[PDB]
DNA sequence: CCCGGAACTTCG
DNA sequence: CGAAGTTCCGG
């Protein structure tokens, strides 16, 4: 309820939620399901290299919403 | 603009 | 070394 640390966790969830389906799924399978890149690539039927960038780019989007928040 | 993937780099 | 993570040349 409005304390900074609380604003930050909500910002993380909210940003994951608004990501493009592929980025959201790739970051979700990695962070919440704890899957390996290999596994995620099978689930998403795509090259693992695409999993690498998708996860990278999903992380970037989360960080661009979080960094403007700390100190 | 929004990323796809593979090369390249770091980490466990 | 194998998995995770970073970068870049496209398309």
Author numbering: 9 to 10, 122 to 190
What text appears in the publication on this structure?
The largest and most diverse subgroup of alternative σ factors, the group IV extracytoplasmic function σ factors, directs the transcription of genes that regulate a wide variety of responses, including envelope stress and pathogenesis. The Ec ECF σ factor σE is an essential protein that directs the response to periplasmic stress. The σE is then free to bind RNAP and drive the transcription of a core set of genes conserved across most bacteria, as well as a more variable set of genes. Promoter-specific transcription initiation first requires the formation of a closed complex in which σ domains 2 (σ2) and 4 (σ4) bind sequence-specifically to the −10 and −35 promoter DNA elements, respectively.
The crystallographically related DNA helices packed head-to-tail, forming a pseudo-continuous double helix with the 1 bp overhangs forming Hoogstein base pairs with the adjacent double helices. Protein–DNA interactions, which occur exclusively within the major groove, extend from −29 to −36, spanning the entire −35 element as well as one base of upstream DNA. Interestingly, the primary base-specific protein–DNA interactions occur at only three positions of the 7-bp −35 element (all Guanines), −35, −34, and −31′. In addition, R176 forms a cation–π interaction with the −36 DNA base, creating a stair motif along with the −35 hydrogen bonds. The protein–DNA base-specific interactions at the −31′ position are almost exclusively from R171, which makes two hydrogen bonds and one van der Waals interaction with the −31′G. In contrast to the numerous base-specific interactions at the −35, −34, and −31′ positions, the −33 and −32 positions each contain only one base-specific contact, in the form of van der Waals interactions between the thymidine C5-methyl groups at −33′ and −32′ with F175 and R171, respectively. Despite not being a true oligo(dA) • oligo(dT) tract as a result of the cytosine insertion at −31, the σE −35 element DNA is relatively straight, with a high degree of propeller twist, and the minor groove width begins to narrow at the start of the −33/−32 AA. The narrow minor groove is stabilized by a network of cross-strand hydrogen bonds between adjacent DNA bases, along with a spine of hydration consisting of water-mediated hydrogen bonds between the two strands.
